[PDB]
Design a protein around this ligand. Sequence first.
Ligand SMILES: O=C(O)[C@]1(O)C=C[C@@H](O)[C@H](O)C1
Ligand SMILES: O=C(O)[C@]1(O)C=C[C@@H](O)[C@H](O)C1
Ligand SMILES: O=C(O)[C@]1(O)C=C[C@@H](O)[C@H](O)C1
Ligand SMILES: O=C(O)[C@]1(O)C=C[C@@H](O)[C@H](O)C1
Ligand SMILES: O=C(O)[C@]1(O)C=C[C@@H](O)[C@H](O)C1
Ligand SMILES: O=C(O)[C@]1(O)C=C[C@@H](O)[C@H](O)C1
Ligand SMILES: O=C(O)[C@]1(O)C=C[C@@H](O)[C@H](O)C1
Ligand SMILES: O=C(O)[C@]1(O)C=C[C@@H](O)[C@H](O)C1
Ligand SMILES: O=C(O)[C@]1(O)C=C[C@@H](O)[C@H](O)C1
Ligand SMILES: O=C(O)[C@]1(O)C=C[C@@H](O)[C@H](O)C1
Ligand SMILES: O=C(O)[C@]1(O)C=C[C@@H](O)[C@H](O)C1
Ligand SMILES: O=C(O)[C@]1(O)C=C[C@@H](O)[C@H](O)C1
Lengths: 149, 149, 149, 149, 149, 149, 149, 149, 149, 149, 149, 149
Amino acid sequence: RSLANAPIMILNGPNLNLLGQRQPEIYGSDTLADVEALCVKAAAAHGGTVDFRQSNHEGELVDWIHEARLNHCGIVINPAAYSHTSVAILDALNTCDGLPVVEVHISNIHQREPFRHHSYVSQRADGVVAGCGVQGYVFGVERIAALAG
Amino acid sequence: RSLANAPIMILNGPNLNLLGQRQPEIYGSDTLADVEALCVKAAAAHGGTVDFRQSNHEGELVDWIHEARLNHCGIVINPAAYSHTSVAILDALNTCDGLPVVEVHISNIHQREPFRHHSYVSQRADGVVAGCGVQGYVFGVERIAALAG
Amino acid sequence: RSLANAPIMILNGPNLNLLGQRQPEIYGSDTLADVEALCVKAAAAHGGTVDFRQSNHEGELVDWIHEARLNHCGIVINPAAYSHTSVAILDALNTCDGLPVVEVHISNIHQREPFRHHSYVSQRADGVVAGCGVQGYVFGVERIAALAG
Amino acid sequence: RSLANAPIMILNGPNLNLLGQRQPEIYGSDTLADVEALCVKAAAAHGGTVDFRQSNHEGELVDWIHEARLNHCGIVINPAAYSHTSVAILDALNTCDGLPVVEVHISNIHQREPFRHHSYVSQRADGVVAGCGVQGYVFGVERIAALAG
Amino acid sequence: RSLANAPIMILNGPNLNLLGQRQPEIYGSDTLADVEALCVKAAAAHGGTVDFRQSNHEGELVDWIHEARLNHCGIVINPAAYSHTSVAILDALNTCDGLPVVEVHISNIHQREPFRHHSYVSQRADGVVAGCGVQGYVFGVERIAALAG
Amino acid sequence: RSLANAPIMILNGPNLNLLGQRQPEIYGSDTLADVEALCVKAAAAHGGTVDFRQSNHEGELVDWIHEARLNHCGIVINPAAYSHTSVAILDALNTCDGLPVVEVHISNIHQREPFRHHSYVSQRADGVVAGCGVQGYVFGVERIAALAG
Amino acid sequence: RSLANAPIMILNGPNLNLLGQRQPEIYGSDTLADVEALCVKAAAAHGGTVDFRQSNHEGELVDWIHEARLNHCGIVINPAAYSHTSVAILDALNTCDGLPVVEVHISNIHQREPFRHHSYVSQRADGVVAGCGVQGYVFGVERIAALAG
Amino acid sequence: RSLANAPIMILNGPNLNLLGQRQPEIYGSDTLADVEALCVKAAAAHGGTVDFRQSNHEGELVDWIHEARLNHCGIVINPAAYSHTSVAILDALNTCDGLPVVEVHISNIHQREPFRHHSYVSQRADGVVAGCGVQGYVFGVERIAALAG
Amino acid sequence: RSLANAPIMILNGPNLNLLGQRQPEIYGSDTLADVEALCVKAAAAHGGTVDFRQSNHEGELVDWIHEARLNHCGIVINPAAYSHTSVAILDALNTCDGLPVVEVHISNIHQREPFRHHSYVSQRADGVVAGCGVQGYVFGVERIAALAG
Amino acid sequence: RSLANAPIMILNGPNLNLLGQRQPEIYGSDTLADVEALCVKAAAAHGGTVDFRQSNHEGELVDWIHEARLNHCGIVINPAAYSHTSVAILDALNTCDGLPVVEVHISNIHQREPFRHHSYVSQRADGVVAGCGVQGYVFGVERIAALAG
Amino acid sequence: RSLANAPIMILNGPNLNLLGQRQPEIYGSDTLADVEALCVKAAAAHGGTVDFRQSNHEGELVDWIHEARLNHCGIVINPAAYSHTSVAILDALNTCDGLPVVEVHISNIHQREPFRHHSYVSQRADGVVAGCGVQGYVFGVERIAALAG
Amino acid sequence: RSLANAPIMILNGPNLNLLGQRQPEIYGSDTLADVEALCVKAAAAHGGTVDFRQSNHEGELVDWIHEARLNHCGIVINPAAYSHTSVAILDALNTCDGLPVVEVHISNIHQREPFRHHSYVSQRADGVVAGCGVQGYVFGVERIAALAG
Ligand SMILES: O=C(O)[C@]1(O)C=C[C@@H](O)[C@H](O)C1
Ligand SMILES: O=C(O)[C@]1(O)C=C[C@@H](O)[C@H](O)C1
Ligand SMILES: O=C(O)[C@]1(O)C=C[C@@H](O)[C@H](O)C1
Ligand SMILES: O=C(O)[C@]1(O)C=C[C@@H](O)[C@H](O)C1
Ligand SMILES: O=C(O)[C@]1(O)C=C[C@@H](O)[C@H](O)C1
Ligand SMILES: O=C(O)[C@]1(O)C=C[C@@H](O)[C@H](O)C1
Ligand SMILES: O=C(O)[C@]1(O)C=C[C@@H](O)[C@H](O)C1
Ligand SMILES: O=C(O)[C@]1(O)C=C[C@@H](O)[C@H](O)C1
Ligand SMILES: O=C(O)[C@]1(O)C=C[C@@H](O)[C@H](O)C1
Ligand SMILES: O=C(O)[C@]1(O)C=C[C@@H](O)[C@H](O)C1
Ligand SMILES: O=C(O)[C@]1(O)C=C[C@@H](O)[C@H](O)C1
Ligand SMILES: O=C(O)[C@]1(O)C=C[C@@H](O)[C@H](O)C1
């Protein structure tokens, strides 16, 4: 699907419901609603739209990726803690044959604890953006626009 | 229990709802409905029945293992990605004292990525069948029939 | 918050709904209701109350931790299998800046399988009690009382 | 070949000559002759025949695999201890381009010592059956019949 | 032995003679004599007594464990650095067949350097309390009281 | 320094002089000169300029990072093979106290050989962009512009 | 069986046919025939006899172990290189339920290459003698005599 | 010994009897007989002769190395799978004090599976040639000629 | 020195003072005094004498090794837990240039916990006897007698 | 290119300028001039020529590999220390699509320190010759000649 | 403290009482008394004094560190074998907040056995001198004088 | 060469040209020029001279080591980041047969990131001084003076 014909699915993993409420040095002071607005504006500049969601549930994220597979033009995902533990989310992303996928981490996971160094999502994501703050979601949208083009 | 007195529980993990829709070289062209019909027929030859289910949710699979512990004669389980990550499912199976359990993988996990080589489920499953296609489910039913009898 | 102003959240992870129904040599013969009663009693000695819950779902435990963050004076948590697998639970506890957290394991995980030796929760928990039986939940409450103090 | 045109080679590795003479809790009370008879019946149900053999010598197994490559319709193999050590037997099975191969372990190797967890044969075998008892030999014959078919 | 018939042995390993003289953020401001008084009071509520000792010598701790084996109703032990290095103290505790043993760490060793994450003492200790401050020694006395009971 | 007062230094490591001349599936069909033009255009949208360079020499990259430290407003660096081996380039970037640094990889290193999975540069780079193709350089420029502001 | 009733099987692995022909600093200057005569004498002192053998073939050693299992009073084995590689020989010795088995190495394998530090045979052997030269074989016989008694 | 007084022993390990019958991309289209003819021609240019053998049995290869130790001027060996598993063959080559030994792999083992990266044989072989095709056997012969002369 | 001119030092590490009091399946039912008497008899058959000692202190063992270096004809040592942890004792034994040293373990340390598999003493000991019960001390004395001769 | 149309590039890494001035037991007594002459002679026998060079600089070797890519018929490379450290040299060789490359080590790196066992160049080199002395360069030229044919 | 007000504590670990009596190639021919006189002179050149001690006992070293913490101006310590094993000595040095500590090894531990490569002491020592012979004790005194100054 | 006949070569690795310009807590406030003057003064006390150099290029350091080999009386080297990555510098130092070499690190690399813990240079350096500040260079000069004289 193109940007004109279907929304970009923007998915957020566990604990990102609290974004902006603490740890500004690591995660910044923008809320998840602030991130949604950034994505909406970036996508509008390419004539597309976004379907922005957040869950603390691994299986719900799996269900949402299956929905994106059929109805969306691409996926921008910040898997949060599930990046490091979820083979199930990797496997769900592997069912999206041909769909542009971009993984985003607000923080630079490579400077953090060793358990954050590996991401199962990175094995499938086309592109991976880390440590570029909430600006990394706008890079994600930009990349999806380039790949759907 | 016996096969005459209670159904065999057949559980399927995440992403298996899309079985048959892609990657036929790895997973075959049969759907989960097709697999259920194979199971039904196998169990009927021993005078039993099957209770066939699929979920993307780790805790729901744990709930359904607890249900089987009280109401079913055995468990045939393809845990899918949770095979490799879920201690919780292993611990649910460990509560099934004396209940026959057979783990099934459609694909030969030993030939795939190194993160697929280890299964927590194998530490409790009585028997483990891998790489026998969807025919592996039928072996699971036949093994349960032999262990219940 | 103080114990006088808000309850202590007591959280139990997967399979603990079956406590007391098997494996008494490892887990004892007390049920979760019995454990709840021990907690209520220990908190009442400090003029406090408890909010005792159990779930098999990782995401639900995350949600409950966010709830505690806002409404409770501390968290006593037995993460069960999720101790060993959940970065998501650890990141949920990390959002509880300044809240006392005590991790409890009924069994001595250090004598058990190697996959049980590490817990993600222990990186954030203030205190960790293992192998003191259900009495460890009483120690948990006492520790929360001292810390809220 | 088809089952009608050539026998299924069934190969057994070291120490399996003593099957049934000890450790019934691990290996059962059936002898290797008993297993051969189970196999003859199982193949007969599909119109086929078996060529059942046992050796304690790695090189002899290698030679029999080369023989099977030219004269048999498939290989069912219980490599026994050589499962864990023999690159040479893996390399012999790799020469059997297009020939169905099924690996069988009576015992659930995944519950045993860590040196039994890895099998070189599993990298080539189409299907691997473990912990289904001597019934796993019947499953192997069934899977060869399905693949040859 | 019951608490009424014999003292509880409380053993402290190297450098704990300086407890409370520095690093209050990790170890607190209480001295070892303050700890002994906390223990004396906890045991007296159960009609017991304590024999509280500290040594910088691995061998002397072994010697004291052999003494407790014959004359004491349980052992509460903070092995300090020897937790991480002493097979000899583990072996000594192993000789105390049926004697209740609780290991205590004032600090949460799981949040510290990786060499502190493993304890040889935890392989035999019935229960292990870490990161509950000096209050952990009171938990130890209470657990010994319950086990001796 | 601000974008208006000093150029962004854009450094490229070994073998990138051949970009576009082969392996288009991994690295694309754009040349390094094409990449420079993308960078020039992106910086000019923010009123800035770029100083674009390429070297096969680890010690020359070090020199250029020292130059940037004193004269440039930020660094966008694709260290190429030196990402995986160069502690010297990491230490050079560590001397750039307060300067924004963004690391770029054309390819998704996480999907490639395991020796490409670790980057020493990632330990200092504020942000890391991988597998966004040559568009990642534009993301780099955009992130420097945001951080210099 | 007793020593009076049946011989002690003395088995030697690969390359020991050349004992005494080189490397006297590691293996001594006695030949295998000289070792056999030492064994014959030691067994004669206890009213017993020996059946002394050497082979370069793993399978042959397995066959000889199965023979000893039925016809001999114990096994003294120097498995030579197969000590480090042969799961098959370990599994053969495991069939010898109740039979005394002593493993002998002329050299001190623990001072040699790291690949010599682990022996599969040591997992079953009752006793293991290393670095005692050919005199170790005499100790082997004496231990068998004590265990058969 | 010189090439004029004794033959060069050329030894081939398991599965090499099928050389040229499959996998030409890895092993080429020449058969083992073709390889022997190349070696005969190379040795004849130096006035020597070859004694060319192949075996699937580890112990037979050990036996032939002992034979070469007394009767041959050097050994060119392609140990095939035994390269990766056989301490026994390493130990047999170690008995050939002063005899030139060259190890040959047709394929480039370093580009293949990780289990093929290590060779026990390489610890004793004077020279090791890998990935030069069947031409590596000719190199082997030429190096023996230089070492013996 | 010779056996006629100076005693054999027989040293025992921690917890061996309790030998025979428990765990007869692992350590036998003989006491340390019984072992000493065995040693006295074995040395006397060679015209020698023994100096038998036990300590729980690593430093004391070190001191006794220095004493043996100047006054005794050899050392038989069961380092007990210090086998696994004491570089100091290894370093003490390394000062005994030319003195025969035999390490003894009553139990077969290779069948036990992995932390018992490695001994620092085995690096210097001439001979190492394990799993031969208290009879291994007699083998130690005999080996010292042979080496002193 | 063919050998008649373009020279064979022979590259030598760091410290090889001192070849023959020391360590003759490892490296021999031939100088680099001697090696060059060997190469010239071997190439001339195939109607070819050589371009023989040495550098201590990783980046200069990269540059020379790029030159060869365009102007030479193949590369014989002894990367010396860079063999073990240089991803940049491997990636330069990876740009030589279709060009024959042979890696040469004078010494048998497999018998030396463990840090010399792995070579990054071996991942791309067609053939790898180790331990055949300076004669290995002659084999390298011969292999280039066969591959260019 | 200053050098004028208190002596520099110079501590030596196990086996250094025999310094100079053997292994001169590793440890030199100076005795520990010789080293003490070198230290007295080096300290006198700065107007200071030394308190030089040696012990084979880990806990005595800990006791002496605690003494130094209160009464000395610095510590120069050669922990000998305890450098690699003692967390306890590391913890005692950690109690010396603000006191200059320099670790000295006579030998170059980095050229020796891998178990000597790591030192727990080096985590707290300000400076670490290795392989400079007994002259390293003079460097240690010199550094304490500079830090105290 | 003696200190009277030839200068001491003092080599400095990458980034040390910025010494004193930042990170005084780790590296001090002295510049490289200040360090050179300390060296010149230390050497002059022994009647010697220094040749002090710094480079960011690995091959230039190799070249300067080859120069020292022929013209200088020893090497004092702070390899900076190359300590951790350069097998080439180790190999250059290994050509300096009989020349005294002292490695110096201003910082205590053992307290820093794990990648700084290993130094290839330490395998060849006679002595290694770490964490003694710039004074470590003076100890280097003194050690060279003692070894040369
Ligand atoms: O946005 C992130 O930086 C992160 O993805 C979010 C949550 C964490 O759990 C990840 O480690 C990082
Ligand atoms: O059926 C299988 O082969 C598998 O269980 C299904 C999904 C994957 O996640 C498992 O790795 C394999
Ligand atoms: O209470 C416990 O001991 C435990 O937390 C509960 C369940 C298991 O999964 C944990 O490993 C232990
Ligand atoms: O059938 C089996 O279970 C096994 O294959 C037989 C022998 C053992 O050596 C294997 O580990 C398992
Ligand atoms: O009490 C503690 O927290 C500890 O046991 C004491 C000293 C340290 O050596 C231990 O690591 C922790
Ligand atoms: O742009 C890249 O993808 C890369 O940085 C370039 C060259 C390689 O050496 C890196 O691995 C990746
Ligand atoms: O007797 C020995 O010392 C040994 O068993 C014989 C041959 C080697 O292969 C073993 O490693 C040691
Ligand atoms: O010739 C070879 O390339 C090889 O030696 C032969 C067979 C394999 O088993 C080796 O791994 C490679
Ligand atoms: O005699 C033994 O078997 C042992 O040496 C004694 C005590 C233990 O600590 C050792 O592991 C074994
Ligand atoms: O030719 C060699 O043997 C080598 O390539 C040269 C220098 C060393 O650095 C290599 O390890 C080996
Ligand atoms: O001074 C030394 O070099 C050493 O500290 C002394 C004894 C050994 O145990 C250490 O490893 C090194
Ligand atoms: O002087 C030092 O401490 C160091 O050598 C200099 C730079 C770093 O790269 C080293 O790790 C340390």
